[PDB]
Design an enzyme around this catalytic site. Structure first.
Site, PDB file in Angstrom:
ATOM      1  N   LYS D 213       0.819  -1.195   0.000  1.00 24.25           N
ATOM      2  CA  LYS D 213       0.000   0.000   0.000  1.00 24.25           C
ATOM      3  C   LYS D 213       0.865   1.263   0.000  1.00 24.25           C
ATOM      4  O   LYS D 213       2.072   1.247   0.330  1.00 24.25           O
ATOM      5  CB  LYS D 213      -0.964  -0.058   1.194  1.00 24.25           C
ATOM      6  CG  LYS D 213      -2.043  -1.144   0.944  1.00 24.25           C
ATOM      7  CD  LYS D 213      -3.413  -0.772   1.472  1.00 24.25           C
ATOM      8  CE  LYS D 213      -4.504  -1.685   0.903  1.00 24.25           C
ATOM      9  NZ  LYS D 213      -5.507  -2.066   1.934  1.00 24.25           N
ATOM     10  N   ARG D 248      -4.150 -10.177   4.561  1.00 26.56           N
ATOM     11  CA  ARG D 248      -4.496 -10.129   3.130  1.00 26.56           C
ATOM     12  C   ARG D 248      -3.267  -9.621   2.357  1.00 26.56           C
ATOM     13  O   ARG D 248      -2.909  -8.445   2.449  1.00 26.56           O
ATOM     14  CB  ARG D 248      -5.730  -9.242   2.902  1.00 26.56           C
ATOM     15  CG  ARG D 248      -6.190  -9.160   1.417  1.00 26.56           C
ATOM     16  CD  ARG D 248      -7.476  -8.348   1.264  1.00 26.56           C
ATOM     17  NE  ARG D 248      -7.840  -8.349  -0.150  1.00 26.56           N
ATOM     18  CZ  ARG D 248      -7.454  -7.423  -1.025  1.00 26.56           C
ATOM     19  NH1 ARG D 248      -6.718  -6.405  -0.628  1.00 26.56           N
ATOM     20  NH2 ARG D 248      -7.818  -7.509  -2.294  1.00 26.56           N
TER      21      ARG D 248
HETATM   22  N1  LIG Z   1      -7.861  -1.096  -2.296  1.00 26.30           N
HETATM   23  C1  LIG Z   1      -6.726  -0.247  -1.959  1.00 26.30           C
HETATM   24  C2  LIG Z   1      -6.820   0.734  -0.974  1.00 26.30           C
HETATM   25  C3  LIG Z   1      -5.736   1.539  -0.661  1.00 26.30           C
HETATM   26  C4  LIG Z   1      -4.550   1.357  -1.351  1.00 26.30           C
HETATM   27  C5  LIG Z   1      -3.315   2.205  -1.063  1.00 26.30           C
HETATM   28  O1  LIG Z   1      -3.326   3.070  -0.163  1.00 26.30           O
HETATM   29  O2  LIG Z   1      -2.280   2.039  -1.751  1.00 26.30           O
HETATM   30  C6  LIG Z   1      -4.455   0.379  -2.329  1.00 26.30           C
HETATM   31  C7  LIG Z   1      -5.533  -0.430  -2.641  1.00 26.30           C
END
Ligand SMILES: Nc1ccc(C(=O)O)cc1
Ligand SMILES: Nc1ccc(C(=O)O)cc1
Ligand SMILES: Nc1ccc(C(=O)O)cc1
Ligand SMILES: Nc1ccc(C(=O)O)cc1
Ligand SMILES: Nc1ccc(C(=O)O)cc1
Ligand SMILES: Nc1ccc(C(=O)O)cc1
Ligand SMILES: Nc1ccc(C(=O)O)cc1
Ligand SMILES: Nc1ccc(C(=O)O)cc1
Lengths: 264, 273, 259, 269
Positions: D213, D248
């Site tokens: 993320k 996850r």
């Molecule tokens: N479903 C998602 C939600 C957030 C992010 C992210 O912050 O990179 C990536 C995918």
């Protein structure tokens, strides 16, 4: 001399170089309100991917059923994109209703052989694509290139005699299931001969079985690379409209070719 | 009548364009290193490229991309030799080693490599002696370095490659083992790269096979507006088909299956009288 | 928190610092070994190492060890700003390495080699005392006992306590089970008043826990072991995989910084 | 230990379990010239099963920042063929990542045994679907600036447990997810991870998802998602240490190895 300039109900398509027609199918596949919403989203994605025009088709059906599928998609795409829109139909009443709703071109697999189709297109004064069409085995041709040529001359002349201006005609040799793999390859190899009928040529080999047979690719999405290659070859051999699913990839291939071809 | 290259016993026939799959052996080429070795990831990739229809594999352990840090010979050997040893045992394809160092050329051929792809065109001291001793095919590439302006990039590349062909022959390297490469992307702007591709037939008239490698390069990105290298596949396949139409007999690519498909459709069309 | 003066290059142990491994030992593939080691050390510096550990023994005579480590130290001391440690148990190598620029000694023998105590006392650099002995009745207690004895012997030789570090010696001198015992009980070794170095990088015990046979397959398990070691008090982590370890420690530091 | 009945496939949460991410999007693959999106996703799910995933999470709509909404017919055309193929070729439990009631029902009929919902059933019909379908369901938090992100996420997650409660959604089927990355800054994400034990005190298993993320990239200075693996594995181990029972992730083998080392250490008295 002068590059074809197609006035698609006010949206101009200039064929000074090959243009990409993005395929927007509106046919229920058991996955029709949800079909219309998916078709509109798809058309917007293909516009984002660089399509020069979109081809909206609701057949694989009575006119009223074809209209329930294509008209909402045309109305939404006319409002949400600036692209010329083509409608895939052979039925004159669908042609008239589609143009009234915003379509600017007719792509006719029957080459206006449906009763009333010549008069409709003459009345509507939009561009029209005349395709050659004569599952199981494809028919045998003694000389597929000569036969397609003869047929398209007959349809071009019938359209002119019905009052359709030659500057609104396009032809399509009808790559796909009405020809064997060998005959499709013959038509592609000899495509420059069909480009000398004084009208722009549309080539549509997208994800078709012949491409799959040449490359050993069983499913349509596996045929993308071979399809992009076929469309580049068709453009090199004179095709000015390419009817494709894979818009971004085809645009990329044509752009690299255009940069190279621009060198003296 | 078509060139037949004997790559250490594995025969490469250039009766049509052949596809050279890129096998980079660098820790940065992979993101699975948490549980995989660099060697094993490169071997698995080479095996996938062979399955996708590559005609030969090009194994390299030193990046020559803009801004790369030089790889010391001991590390280059630690990367490429174990990969060649495993791929020679697990494939039937000719294997090329992408190196400019004679020590790596000799060790790689002893390990099973059958061709040398040299970005320095044998200008490293000892490279001529190695290739003459090893009796394998060699690709001579053009590069100014190891982004210059050219007065006439096509003529300058042509002149350099004539000179390197001549230098190689005068060192005892058989002319039938020579290949040349204009070096797309190496010290060339997008415009120079397009010029070299458009005028590629002029280089195929030196009587030696020409390798073209534009795969996912920055110039393809500029032409198509695709910022990330993985987004450049369609533009790369188109560039390689254009190169093959203009006489290239070897195509150095990442996207082997897609390139094979494009060449296959073109071959079917070209086969029509 | 400990302030380590590594021959003028200051290492602040307010949080775990990463010691990048620079081996200078010939293998299946001298001058080319030195050039590769220097390049590797510069790469680990770019990856965020807080210090580099240069070693020329994995039996190697002193004269041979010097030909390996000294050129590497000389080049790295000039081309990086990092503190440099020399991994050796031989006093003559310790003295030459410090004269060449080394600022710390990592001794697998914990200064038990004849002359080692007096050498390090003379040199005034920090030293890591490792445990090396196998079966133990109580491995944690045995390692603790040994390291107390070696800390005291170093202090009685004139090495200031502020220059001492200890290392439980994860690795082949312990079974997998005993290595896991020392990691679980590492906080007990952090209570000897000296910083603790943990080195589990790509070791066989991590491989045995995870079923990863080759050293580069052990990277994820090694980074995990080093984060656990840092959570349990280790202030230096001796690793091959510097960027990955720096990344894991950085995420842990962000979480730990929340009250 | 909690046992989840995912359509006959039991997920036992006696230890943290790894949920492998299987995205079914044309943008998620580069081999589309010669592969279908479905076949690439199935092959990926089978690779994650081989790497030790305890369950697979199959999703056809990206909820990342700025994604264009995916029409239901297209979401179905992506996820259903992947579920059908994976139910036949793996014995692992399968979850569907969707907020649309129509996809939830179709996915379970195709073989899915679990539903992962980013909108926490705020979609009309989702509560009724989830109550009707009676498979385990992950209730995720999604909304930007907060006054106290942990309490606000806690409050919202309480209300959705309460909102879900009393539709026949057995509390034994509820999972919560604080929703890292969804409308939360790097600082807000770090806050929620630090205080994760406080959300684990509601008696329902907790899922943490920080894989590659943007927050991980910001903390570590890793611009591309594929460069974020080490920081992601560290985040998921911290989450497992702070009570998460589901993780996850994209990087299944690495996360499994990290969990294996921690379990060996944690097992020492
Ligand atoms: N479903 C998602 C939600 C957030 C992010 C992210 O912050 O990179 C990536 C995918
Ligand atoms: N958001 C989306 C919209 C349309 C499509 C598609 O037509 O494939 C996919 C995603
Ligand atoms: N490529 C990598 C993958 C994973 C890790 C890790 O788990 O720390 C490190 C590197
Ligand atoms: N097991 C495999 C791992 C990787 C590849 C590949 O890199 O194409 C192929 C197979
Ligand atoms: N080895 C090379 C790799 C890439 C490029 C480029 O992208 O221009 C050039 C050289
Ligand atoms: N350019 C370099 C790349 C890698 C290394 C190394 O692995 O030590 C050294 C130099
Ligand atoms: N993802 C793609 C890969 C390859 C091609 C192509 O060869 O045109 C197109 C798209
Ligand atoms: N056989 C394989 C196919 C696909 C993948 C993957 O996408 O990770 C891995 C293995």
């Amino acid at each position: 001399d002068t590059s074809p300039r197609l006035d698609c109900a006010g949206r101009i398509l200039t064929l000074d170089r090959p243009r990409v027609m993005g395929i927007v199918n509106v046919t229920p596949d058991s996955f029709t309100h949800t079909t219309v919403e998916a078709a509109v989203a798809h058309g917007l994605r293909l516009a984002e991917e660089g399509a020069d025009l979109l081809d909206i088709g609701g057949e694989s059906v009575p006119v009223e059923e074809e209209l329930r599928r294509v008209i909402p998609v045309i109305e939404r795409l006319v409002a949400q994109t600036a692209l010329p829109l083509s409608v895939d139909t052979f039925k004159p009443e669908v042609m008239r209703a589609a143009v009234a709703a915003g379509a600017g071109m007719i792509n006719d697999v029957q080459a206006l052989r449906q009763p009333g189709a010549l008069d409709a297109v003459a009345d509507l004064r939009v561009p029209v694509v005349l395709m050659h069409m004569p599952a199981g085995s494809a028919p045998h041709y003694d000389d597929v290139v000569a036969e397609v040529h003869r047929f398209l001359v007959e349809r071009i002349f019938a359209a002119e005699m019905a009052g359709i201006d030659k500057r609104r005609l396009l032809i399509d040799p009808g790559f796909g299931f009405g020809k064997s793999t060998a005959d499709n390859v013959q038509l592609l190899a000899h495509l420059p001969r069909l480009c000398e009928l004084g009208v722009p040529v549309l080539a549509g080999l997208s994800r078709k079985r012949s491409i799959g047979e040449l490359t050993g690719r069983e499913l349509p999405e596996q045929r993308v690379a071979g399809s992009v290659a076929a469309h580049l070859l068709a453009a090199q051999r004179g095709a000015l409209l390419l009817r494709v699913h894979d818009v971004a990839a085809t645009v990329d291939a044509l752009t690299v070719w255009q940069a190279v071809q621009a060198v003296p």
